[PDB]
């Protein structure tokens, strides 16, 4: 459970980190004070116990960190040479393109491991104007977005990229409606699931085209950023 | 009489494995936490035999995420016309990855089973992949992994015997192989990264020839 002056801790913590996030973050802390089973230990920073002042202050940096752009990263795992032997000797992938196949495999795994994060970013850009809050970083378990609605009731939303997405999670809601759960894509079949995205202000904006346009924009911007890194060295 | 029940069950399924399967049932009778009544042993006999069937490399059945092609195109600059090719080679690489661990066991099985070790085929044995009853009747057990960080790992307690000799072929973070540290046992000398490559190429050559005659 949370300390006696949780909100005032949150405010000043995020004022040092990023003043534009302070209001939103303060509300996240209030949400976790009312709903403590959604509170999670911070990944990489587990030294601070869930609910203490030290956790609130560490959560502020974490919450902001979560919103910095991620670069699509192929894993640093050196590939198995026997994978290439199988591509060449069974699947008849030409021997001179084996190195290429190896790299695109790694890029494809890098693409896969950031799509979940970009989905949250897309959704956040659309629904944060209307008062919803993307719970960025790892301080919140199970819930990806929160909203204190016009009736002062906590709404909460979980998104997955796929229906068979690995990290399933649930947390108990002491005060609020049940967590709305939604997945973008099907593992069983082609197509998307935006039609059944839970009702909330701004919902009509959200779609697969919208998400595709967000991703083109985010990667274009990011490419341009890394171009400026080489000019600044 | 679990040994006699194990004998009969495997005589029904495949008599060529009845000797090896019985010794594995003896191993799980002494070390029941490695086990993954009479009906269990009948079921196991099929599982163990199934694990010895030649397995084809199969790309996953799964439907690709359309956004992966977009990220390949728009971040990593893979051309429009090559995206489908990239998608398919990714699927093929996963199917290759999904079988290398199996090919590794079969290779080791070919070498060390003639020296009285037994391949724990199928998934009836948790963690442990090979076993042996040494000259003084003690259970030596061996657990093989393709990579040091290989995605999933399942584990068991040794009740009676020496600890589980653990070993992996390749490293996640650096190039090369780890065959130099393979556990001491009869036939260790014939196991290498080159022996394995040759075994895989001959294995896949034979599969391709079978697939040619079928269609
Ligand atoms: Ca989730
Ligand atoms: Ca989350």
Author numbering:
A (entry chain A): 4 to 236
B (entry chain B): 8 to 43, 55 to 233
Per the authors:
AvaII was prepared for crystallization in the presence of 5 mM Ca2+ ions. An ‘open’ conformation of the AvaII dimer is observed in the absence of nucleic acids and in complex with the RNA/DNA heteroduplex. In this form, the AvaII central channel is too wide for base-specific interactions with the bound oligoduplex and the enzyme only contacts the phosphodiester backbone. The two open forms (in the absence of nucleic acids and in the scanning complex with the RNA/DNA duplex) are almost identical and no dynamic motions are found between them according to the DynDom server.
AvaII from the filamentous cyanobacterium Anabaena variabilis has attracted our interest because it exhibits robust activity against the RNA and DNA strands of an RNA/DNA heteroduplex. As most other enzymes with such properties, AvaII is a Type II restriction endonuclease predicted to belong to the PD-(D/E)XK superfamily. The enzyme is specific for DNA with the G↓GWCC sequence (where W stands for an A or T base of a ‘weak’ base pair) and cleaves it to products with three nucleotide long 5′-overhangs. The core of the AvaII protomer adopts the same conformation in all three structures, and consists of the characteristic αββββ motif of the PD-(D/E)XK endonucleases.
